[model samples]
Target chain A: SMIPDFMSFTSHIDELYESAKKQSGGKVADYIPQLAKFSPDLWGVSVCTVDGQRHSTGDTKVPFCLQSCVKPLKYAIAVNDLGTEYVHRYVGKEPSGLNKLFLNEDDKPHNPMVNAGAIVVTSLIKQGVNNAEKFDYVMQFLNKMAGNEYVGFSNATFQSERESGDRNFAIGYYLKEKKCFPEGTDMVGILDFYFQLCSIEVTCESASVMAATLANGGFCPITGERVLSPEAVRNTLSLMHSCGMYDFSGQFAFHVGLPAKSGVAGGILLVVPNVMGMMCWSPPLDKMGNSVKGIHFCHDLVSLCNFHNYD
Target chain B: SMIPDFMSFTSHIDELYESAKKQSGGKVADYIPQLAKFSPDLWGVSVCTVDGQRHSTGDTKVPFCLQSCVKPLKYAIAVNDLGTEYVHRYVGKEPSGLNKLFLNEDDKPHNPMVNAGAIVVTSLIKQGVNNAEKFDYVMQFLNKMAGNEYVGFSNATFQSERESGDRNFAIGYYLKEKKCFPEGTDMVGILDFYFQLCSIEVTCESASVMAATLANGGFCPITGERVLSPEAVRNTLSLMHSCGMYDFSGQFAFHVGLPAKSGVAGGILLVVPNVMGMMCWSPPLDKMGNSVKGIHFCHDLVSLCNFHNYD
Candidate 1:
């Protein structure tokens, strides 16, 4: 396996930085105060190849919330806990264009990447031990993938999400009414767990390692631990390509053409099958709340490298 | 007291039509065969009060396709038969911002006016009746409501929709997948009934009277018959206000502030609570594929009359 050196990769990313800085004027997500304070100008990039190689540039150490990006991971866990057939009983595999307000009529959430699907996946976490125990389980798995013991939650951001999640509340209430969840499930506790899980903090470098875990057939290349089942990882990536980025999935699939997930906190996790992983971040978002610089970087990278899987 | 005759009403409509005639380039729905043949230059308007008074102009005698406009009526029948609580189990009252594709989810169709909801309502018909009998029942109801004997299926349009109905087919298949219909229910039969019902040709004059029937709390003043239950009519109108026109329902409700439904053939049936009924047809459409002239006329009427019902 040909692996690029860390410094060499960082140099290339630095060279690629200028072009990826273009602004699309995606308004800062003011729905949450923790997200609203981010500087749109800050950009970062990180990549880790399949052969235990790593690279990072700019504010690569800065932490941000996973936002909705953790959706794929939670979906993977749900699929692992219950088989695909069982998990799918609660969520569909279709990409629900763009709007989050309509949770789709099927009892299933539209796809695992969107809020509705992710919430359902989060709800399916098996009532693991207790809240702290559930959080610990997710944290341990993410830590293994990132190969960073320091990856943990941002309490402030979690609180902000918990406070301003009315739409999520509406979705949960509606889902409960549909009998998708178990009887007498505490909707508030479930939402809090979801919010806290999404608020897990990690740097661009850590994010790349996580993507690398997915890229390496569900194994953390650095730690040599299986982060998820290979089939679960494959389904997660497929959904990432098809429905990961909210309504912009189609354009992203058409253009950047990679299996990826992004968070409102400016983090993007991109996976290249059997080759490498990448992450990019810049807090300013387009209307869909995807990282402006992250999307810019991916588009330029795909176009320049002619790396679209479809082509 | 002097009542304005049809000619005086016709002249006023002609002036309004002249202004509205150019709105044809918005969206032309080629999906449904009967709707594709609309003459963009045509315009029509009809108004009727609950007291049996009627006024009409411009193509008032020309028939057009019904398309989604049949949704509310079918829902009314379903509710009348199964009762609101049972009918609501098959569909929802909320608006689904997501497109028609997402309607098959088990959470209930977003409202009775959307394709998914309409299909659910259509599926809930009395089980023993064959397709022909079901369609005849619908037509008989329409004739009773409009006080016109000629309103029935356009066989040519029904054949067209039957041949080229992939989207509707997809929705039906999805509903079947979700256990929305009985085990042995025929997908083709339900859709056949649906398209035939939608093909029922009603002129602007007939459409206005139908709206007047609903406005009069389900009584056909001209025919002296109770066509719909009062509760059913109210619920149907409410769904129409929020979910009748695909993705444009919110904007329409915001601007026109009335319960309404629009067909691809450019006919719009509008309900003003405790007031008059209106029907307009202008083949030209807006970006949302709603009749541009019809929308313009409705907006003008709402604004001019200082009438709106918004929460």
Candidate 2:
């Protein structure tokens, strides 16, 4: 009888999931062999509220690469490790446009959610360490964010990203030329770390916990463990609200009006702050590179609840 | 024993008030005789949290005209009266840039906060009635929004606005020529009503309740009356967040990062959604037409609390 105000919550989501399931458009990501292996038919939605209430539908347990979805998570870790002022010395401007290289006057990336900024953010992680040590350092936080849930790694995606990440390599070199990375930093190694972080894997269930961690202001709701600082959580959601969806950031901010990030791998990491975190995965992507069904589910979910930041 | 968790919130705001008093900058709005009468030295801050726990500091008891601050309140009324879709047909877009007449392709005003859109929005309120009927209908809603507090009107300011209101008249005529007003709508009467709404008066103490009404989602937090619909409250805050500060909107949204409206009378109606509503009054104006001390206090207050939308 005590249903969510935006609830019947379980039945409501099942309704949304069913409605979204019929949105049969867009193509699966195929830029990399590992990414191309995902089925266009694979679809899932999971929700975890700040009070640790939970729900899942479709292929919620299937593992998928975090891909661009890791950008906000890493940005949060950078802020957690480095503090807001120092972390922002490498990034500026809240995300607005759907394009990249919109660097600030300081010549820093527009925001950490963008490619240049995300790479610079990678350089800032565990500043003096090698890739292996830094990778271990961040993996610990990712697992904590998921409440020690199934945070895993896909070396095949990592390897594939390495083999074909020429655009990122180009961005890394350009950032190096612009002196965008911190002093005495390894640009190529940072990109490698960046790719490794992207290939870090999560099932819809675990990733929803990560979103809920943000919703609860950095405490993983299920485990009751603090995984990020207030500053980290604040700064990360700010950028995600402004720039999380890459090419579709403005439209997404206008329409969905939630903090969300979409990866080419057809994953949308969404945070309905102070409410729930949801991970939506559907392998088919709109031309803007967002998961088409994921976007549909996000729109429908916001329509049902007073969850949009403005709402 | 229970201070607000944004707690010491009372004492903390006292500290911010004391700090802001040192700001001796900008000039009081002097475009009209009534506006010029207030002392630049008068400064006050009043906060009414969503739970109705309240606090006051400095010159909070003095009355001031709502000026442009009335924009959000009237928009809320229009939405409540006509519903979202019907009201928004007269206004469109979430406010962004701090400019006027950024009309959409449909020739509709960019939003309800802008001069053109505010006029259009006024035309939609209590349509098919004479201006007298419309005025009384809105006053009832405004008083309710203030929790039956001191929602008064300044005849002198209304007269002043009428005498020197050529710019607004021009915008009204433009909207009229564009057929922006609905069928049988009287454009001049709507303009007069717009001027009257702007001249509505409130003390920092009472106006804070009006903002709290917004903070509590259209329910007057003190009176516990649902004065506006959920859709009305949600849409009003959305536009206010984007466009409320006029020329200073983008900067305010970025820096203060909250929904706020500032009147030339040196008043700011600020909503810390679901937390509190604040009325900050200082006769001194910044170059951007916001209260200098009000701006300082807002930044400092946000710094102390997790009230900012992203925060």
Candidate 3:
């Protein structure tokens, strides 16, 4: 019983996975050579319910970088460390386009989900003895949230992300010019921390458990350990619900109605609060940078189950 | 019994009003002579519960133009007349700033709550034999939504709005050039109707009833008459929750956690779905064009009643 007492639901989930696999129209993200090297055929689906039920199929064990998926996790961590008031002072909550990354309006990033805001959030990480300690701090937290499952780093991906991250670097400098970072903060260290976090790797099964932790009110369902504060989880979920999918967030909220985060690496980490959490992966990307199969799966998944927020 | 067994709550509401009255910092909207003529001292607070309970104090009956508050009302009417799928063709659901008015990124307005989007929504109204009939159709619906309360029209305000409406005219023309309007839509008539709708006047008491209608699932709380479809109410409230307060919408949602719309005339129509509706008025406005006292009152009211959406 991989999923526990839900044979019919498991079959339906498998069917959705198969149906979404047929959608091969989008391309693998090519901005970074490392991401461009992934096979488009790589696909996976995993789900973890609040009650510790887990299910997975396809290439669920294959690892991939977190990419933009790190945004919400880091945002949650920052909100837990610094209160919402302090964190929001350097970042706004509005949903904005990528153009906002280069702009310096009100000396703040538009929101924590975007590149600029993510960098700002990275700067808020507690000062460690050194940079390795800081990176290890976040990795340790994320690993525990995933029930100590697959959490690895791709040094090649980190090099590619660093070399090819001109846009993000420009955003970092723009934010730096705005004095958005706290005094005594190292701009290079913050950007390096951000790219390093994005380079961290996870399997679909591990990501689902991390999401399930959020669904279970910041406690790891399998490990049964508190990972994030309730207030931090609530705030993170609200932002993810409103702004997680970039330009498609509102549409996703209208249709899928879940707190989810998507990455250009063709992954979606979705949470149905108090119900279950799921993750889908395929190395093909839609124009919006979301996974084509992942989007299709979520659409069918919500339709098959009454997971809509409005419902 | 004036508020039906809520004497303490009524007194607290009055206290909030008095406390907010001291916030005389912002300036009255002076872009248009009509809006600038309002007295900063004229203040009011009114509340209408979903169960037909009413409470009011101060100058709750003084009339003022709806101004931008008409955005949500007209959006609701448009959605009611045409389904969400049909109406969203010319408008997006994203929350954006005023700069979007001049941009034509997607050949549509960013969302129906902005000035450009509101004009596009105005063009979607079902036409009659003439423009006057179209205006009457919407007015009739709005008046009914307010429980046939004091729905007035100010010809002077309409004239001033028309004469000083260059920015709106620019947005209308930009939308028209983008072909954002439906076939056979008269651009001039649409702009005129938009200004006319803004010129429609309501007292705080009547505005609260209108908000109450939305809160009551599009049924008039007092009259118990269906004025908008359930789907229309849901869609409109979602937009209002996300984009109703211009650029300040996200902050307002985080703080107040209610569906609300603001007018340059120093009025705020706020709705707590399934609970109650409130209207606050004061002539002085913040730089965001929201009423200073109105914003203060909503903050205090939500804190006292725990009516936040998250709560």
The full ranking of all candidates by lDDT, starting with the best, is 3, 2, 1
- Fraction of native Cα contacts kept in each candidate? 0.00, 0.20, 0.15
How many clashes in each candidate? Answer: 6, 1, 0
Candidate number of the best DockQ:
3
Q: Which number leads on lDDT? A: 3
Q: Per-residue lDDT tens digits of candidate 1, residues B104-188? A: 3455667787776787788887766888788777777778788763475588988987776655665675566456765578866
Q: Which ten residues in a row have the lowest lDDT in candidate 3 chain B?
A: B96-105
**Per-residue C-alpha lDDT of model 3 across residues A1-311, encoded as one tens digit per residue:** 22346767788889999999899879999888888899999999998888888889889999999899989998999988887999998888767653344444677887888888889989988765577999999999999889999999999999988888888888888788889888878898788888899999999999999999988889998989999987788778878887899878988866676789999999999988877778899989888889999999999987777565533
- Lowest summed lDDT window (length 10), candidate 1 chain A: A1-10
Runs off by more than 4 Å, candidate 1: A1-10, A22-24, A98-105, A182-184, B1-311
lDDT of 2 at B232: 83
Evaluate model 2 with DockQ and give the value. Answer: 0.23
Q: Write model 3 residue lDDT over B1-311, tens digit each, in one string.
A: 22346778788998999999888889999887887788899999998988888999889999999989989999889889898999999888777654454544677787888888888888888855577988889889989999999999999999998988998888878777878888878888889989999999999999999999988888899999999997788778778888887777887877776789999999998988877778898989888879999989888987787666543
Q: What is residue A109's positional error in candidate 1, in angstroms? A: 1.0
DockQ of each: 0.02, 0.23, 0.26
Per-residue CA lDDT of model 2 for B1-311, tens digit only, reads 12346456788889989999999999988999999999999999998988988899999988899988988888888878788778767777554322245366568887788778888888888877788888899888888988888888899999999999999999888888888889987788889999998888898999999998898878888989899987888777767776677666755665667889988999999998778888999988988889999999888877776567866
2 or 3: which has the higher DockQ? Answer: 3
- Model 2 docking grade: acceptable
